[PDB]
Amino acid sequence: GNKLFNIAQRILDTNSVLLTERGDHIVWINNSWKFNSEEPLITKLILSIRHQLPKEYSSELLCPRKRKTVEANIRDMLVDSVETDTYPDKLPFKNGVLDLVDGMFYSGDDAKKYTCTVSTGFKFDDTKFVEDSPEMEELMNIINDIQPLTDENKKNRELYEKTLSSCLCGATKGCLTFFFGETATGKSTTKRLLKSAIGDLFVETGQTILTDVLDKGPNPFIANMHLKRSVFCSELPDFACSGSKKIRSDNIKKLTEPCVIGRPCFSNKINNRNHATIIIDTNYKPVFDRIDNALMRRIAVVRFRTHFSQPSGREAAENNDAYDKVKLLDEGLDGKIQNNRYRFAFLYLLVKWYKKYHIPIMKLYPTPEEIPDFAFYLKIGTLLVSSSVKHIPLMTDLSKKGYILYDNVVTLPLTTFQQKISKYFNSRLFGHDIESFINRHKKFADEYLQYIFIEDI
Amino acid sequence: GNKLFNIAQRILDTNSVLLTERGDHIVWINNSWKFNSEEPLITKLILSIRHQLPKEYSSELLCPRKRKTVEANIRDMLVDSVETDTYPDKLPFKNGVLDLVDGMFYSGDDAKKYTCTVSTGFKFDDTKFVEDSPEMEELMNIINDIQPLTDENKKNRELYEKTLSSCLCGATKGCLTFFFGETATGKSTTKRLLKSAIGDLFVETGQTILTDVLDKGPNPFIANMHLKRSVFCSELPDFACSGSKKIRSDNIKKLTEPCVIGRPCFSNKINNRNHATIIIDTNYKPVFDRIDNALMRRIAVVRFRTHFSQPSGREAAENNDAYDKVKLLDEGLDGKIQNNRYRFAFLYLLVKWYKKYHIPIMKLYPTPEEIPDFAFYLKIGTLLVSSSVKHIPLMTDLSKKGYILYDNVVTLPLTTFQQKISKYFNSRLFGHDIESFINRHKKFADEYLQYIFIEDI
Amino acid sequence: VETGQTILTDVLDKGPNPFIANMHLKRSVFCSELPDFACSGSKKIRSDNIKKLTEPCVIGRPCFSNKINNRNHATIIIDTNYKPVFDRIDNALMRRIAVVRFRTHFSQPSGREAAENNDAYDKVKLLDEGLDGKIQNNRYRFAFLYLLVKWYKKYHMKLYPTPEEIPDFAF
DNA sequence: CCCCC
Numbered sequence A, B: 001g002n003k004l005f006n007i008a009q010r011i012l013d014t015n016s017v018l019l020t021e022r023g024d025h026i027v028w029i030n031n032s033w034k035f036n037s038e039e040p041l042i043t044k045l046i047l048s049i050r051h052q053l054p055k056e057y058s059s060e061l062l063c064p065r066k067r068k069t070v071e072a073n074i075r076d077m078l079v080d081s082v083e084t085d086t087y088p089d090k091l092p093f094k095n096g097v098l099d100l101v102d103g104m105f106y107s108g109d110d111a112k113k114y115t116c117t118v119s120t121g122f123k124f125d126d127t128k129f130v131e132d133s134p135e136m137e138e139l140m141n142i143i144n145d146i147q148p149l150t151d152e153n154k155k156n157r158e159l160y161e162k163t164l165s166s167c168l169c170g171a172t173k174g175c176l177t178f179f180f181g182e183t184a185t186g187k188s189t190t191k192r193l194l195k196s197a198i199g200d201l202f203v204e205t206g207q208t209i210l211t212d213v214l215d216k217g218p219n220p221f222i223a224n225m226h227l228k229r230s231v232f233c234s235e236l237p238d239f240a241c242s243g244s245k246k247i248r249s250d251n252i253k254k255l256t257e258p259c260v261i262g263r264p265c266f267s268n269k270i271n272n273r274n275h276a277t278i279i280i281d282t283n284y285k286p287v288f289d290r291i292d293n294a295l296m297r298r299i300a301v302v303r304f305r306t307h308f309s310q311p312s313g314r315e316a317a318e319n320n321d322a323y324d325k326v327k328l329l330d331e332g333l334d335g336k337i338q339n340n341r342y343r344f345a346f347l348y349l350l351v352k353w354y355k356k357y358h359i360p361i362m363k364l365y366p367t368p369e370e371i372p373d374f375a376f377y378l379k380i381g382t383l384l385v386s387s388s389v390k391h392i393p394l395m396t397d398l399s400k401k402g403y404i405l406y407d408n409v410v411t412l413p414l415t416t417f418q419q420k421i422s423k424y425f426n427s428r429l430f431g432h433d434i435e436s437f438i439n440r441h442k443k444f445a446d447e448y449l450q451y452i453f454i455e456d457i
Numbered sequence C: 001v002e003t004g005q006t007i008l009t010d011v012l013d014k015g016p017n018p019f020i021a022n023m024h025l026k027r028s029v030f031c032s033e034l035p036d037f038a039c040s041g042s043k044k045i046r047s048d049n050i051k052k053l054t055e056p057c058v059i060g061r062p063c064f065s066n067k068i069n070n071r072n073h074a075t076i077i078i079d080t081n082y083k084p085v086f087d088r089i090d091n092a093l094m095r096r097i098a099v100v101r102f103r104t105h106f107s108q109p110s111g112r113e114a115a116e117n118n119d120a121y122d123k124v125k126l127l128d129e130g131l132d133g134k135i136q137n138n139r140y141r142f143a144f145l146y147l148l149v150k151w152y153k154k155y156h157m158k159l160y161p162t163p164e165e166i167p168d169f170a171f
Numbered sequence D: 001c002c003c004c005c
């Protein structure tokens, strides 16, 4: 009774082909879920699975025509969709899934339950996923060189560890991180170590995702981040020189959301799932077009302060205040990392840090005090208090301080506000910021401002 | 004779395949109407419906080639189009349709009468659609935190509810709503809750639909809005720092019409039905290039004024006038909502609000007062009116007031008009607006304005 | 179909524009709610578009199309309250214009006395509220069609210029 | 379609 339909029915009963909500067909081959939009892999699954069927059914699947017929039947059978990539604490490899909470490695049907449609791209080797090894010792020395274990670097080192370990989580993070340092401090070394450790879950993009409009037309540079767990942007075009495009704060806000809008070439899929830790490597501090409390909530900075130099340039490097430590450059490290020598040692370190910093919830917090741009605003937040009903009685002496009440609200005229605020910031140094604050928060009635200096109280 | 033609005739008689006005082919599979432009579903329907046909006819449908022949017959037989999505009070699910007027869930042929070709994408559960539940108390607490039940917030809160309930109606709305507030006020929480509640009827788009030419070319960002009952745009590139493209009033007007123009890749359907409540998440009020009563009549604003902060930054949050209340941030809420914990509780709340605000006709009303960009024009309503032929005798005092009789109609000079305007408002903060108004109302005979102030009478 | 005032102040070729393209075989077009020209500082009425739009063909790219020529059958009527002052006055606009005069006043009883004294309004009547309700019912559909057919038969055909009807065409 | 413009 239509042998080929029966074969398709059995293959469907195995649950090895699924239809996803984006319209892709994912197949379970070699202990991983795979898909290829440009070329479906269903006939590959049919050929591979021919060994699990009766003897008479297997001999039909050696003809490509019959495999195509079975594929047509399977495509007509799949009507409903499924959801994929819903477990944030599972690390998919090419031959199984690693449980980050437990540490157990699963294969076969154990790994199949988590419909992880992405993977590192390499096989998990449990012989190399060990704590004691010469590779581990070399990597420990390298890491302690890049981020020393001193008391002045404790917070910075902890933030470094937490940011690197968050690249294993399949969830949406609320902060973008800047690896900030001078030249030859180990930022690219860390980037390449992470890329080696996490394989295909890592991606590099261009700066257009920070300075251009994401929707526009086709944009693979934003559609390629779909389901990635780490996104790297490098070589910030510093903006001290005139004409440089600033970073769009709305781009930051859009990149911090669970879904990002953008499509590739020849595609109608306009929304991409955002699971990525976004890191920007820079020698210069960022400059944004507009500054507000929404942006100051999504920025963290890690600093690199160890210089690796040739013997000729060491002495001068010792007289630079951008460095706290000067070491000798090792010319064989780049090739060693390019060969994936520290892949599993760094993976073990990342898993250990994930355990360490995953008190029930792992959350990335901002560091607004590390950005000079924000400085002014922070200082303002420590100087002024919004006028409230509790300040009405204080008017008794507020008049002696220059305060004039109006509509039951304490206010200070523009001239008085300028006189009082010139005592905290240099007019030339903080001209644009002070003017912007005045314009943004100035009232009218002759201009008024609803703020009281904490010192007067 | 011609068994396959007879099978196609029977399938056509079942009424499970229809041709829409745009030319879509909609099929009825698994208790829902479905269409996939770039992936026809007629052969899936043939395979699924083979069971209703006689015994001899069903065995022929196991061959993909025979199914393709039957599909060719069926689509040659379909000459007349039908009307779809004409009931705005039916909510379609993956297994039936819910009546919003009464609250009865239909399945099978009962749901088939309403040709609802879109659905939430998930199955309606009767057990979880309950008024009392542990999740309902948490949802009520969250919603009350975001929009407190206080007199000062009464009216605003209602608008909130109304807008949210309007996401259930399958009709065209005449307003665009702006969710306005400072950072960490619950706007994105509300958006995620609504997305969870209404599934696939919710869509997210880019800001291009607000600041670009809708015609252009193949536009998936507009083609994806077809038959959607909720469209969200986020992160307006505000204009505090001037230099960004403004919102086009032409797009605002095109987005309130029953039909929109936009076509996907590899498809020819430039016509999309507009059922969507359009909501914009912003930290800054909008600014448009042109202001006119046509644009001023389709804008509404909802305020968010509750701050959720960590204990470290709470005290400062208590001295900001942008917040009426400060709460404690919960780090588990995001993951709870992302896992669809409050899907059915929020659906029940939305249905209750729909019943409450759907007295015979539900309508969305603009709130032009909130927008400051519209402020000056509004003052013109109380500033001056257009003189009629009834202001002849008044000129007896008009000469005393400054106006000079001319053409038997009250009129004012340019300098006199400027002097009179100076009384209502100061040109220091509105001088450019005064100049624009003078140019707009300029009349030349040596230019005079035939406008009468209300106070003048 | 009705058209706005954008066409009278914008170029045709430009980029993606559906308004001009949808004119294909469309049998009428009215520019309504005109941007009164008395507003100094606003762009004046362009005459190049007036001359071009009357051509037997229409040049312009329909959205998501690849043809820049379309049939032009629409009858062009521009309805406004203010006099037209062309941006540039030449022989083309002088010989390619006309004017229709309306002097019927629909005024409410409250404002009838004030409205009647207006010189512009010659006959003043009481506004009929239900007429709009009768318009949407399409009750005057066949009657209007019959009247239009009668007028077309009686008048048949062309449109003569009215240089005197426009003040700016005086000098 | 994208590119191109």
Ligand SMILES: Nc1ncnc2c1ncn2[C@@H]1O[C@H](COP(=O)(O)OP(=O)(O)NP(=O)(O)O)[C@@H](O)[C@H]1O
Pocket (backbone or CB within 6 Å): A141, A142, A143, A145, A146, A182, A183, A184, A185, A186, A187, A188, A189, A190, A283, A308, A327, A328, A329, A330, A331, A333, A334
């Ligand atoms: N212990 C060490 N750890 C890391 N890198 C080391 C170490 N010893 C030597 N190096 C090398 O010193 C150089 C450090 O610069 P590298 O990390 O490549 O770039 P960067 O300083 O991050 N970026 P840039 O400023 O643009 O040059 C590389 O050649 C490293 O391989």
Ligand SMILES: Nc1ncnc2c1ncn2[C@@H]1O[C@H](COP(=O)(O)OP(=O)(O)NP(=O)(O)O)[C@@H](O)[C@H]1O
Pocket (backbone or CB within 6 Å): A294, A297, B141, B142, B145, B146, B181, B182, B183, B184, B185, B186, B187, B188, B189, B190, B283, B308, B327, B328, B329, B330, B331, B333, B334
């Ligand atoms: N009761 C509560 N109601 C709403 N959000 C809450 C509540 N308790 C904690 N939160 C959290 O507080 C945070 C507020 O952020 P969010 O909901 O995105 O606000 P927002 O106003 O959209 N922020 P922003 O884009 O910066 O202006 C989120 O982590 C919420 O989950």
Ligand SMILES: [Mg+2]
Pocket (backbone or CB within 6 Å): A187, A188
């Ligand atoms: Mg480098």
Ligand SMILES: [Mg+2]
Pocket (backbone or CB within 6 Å): B187, B188
């Ligand atoms: Mg938000």
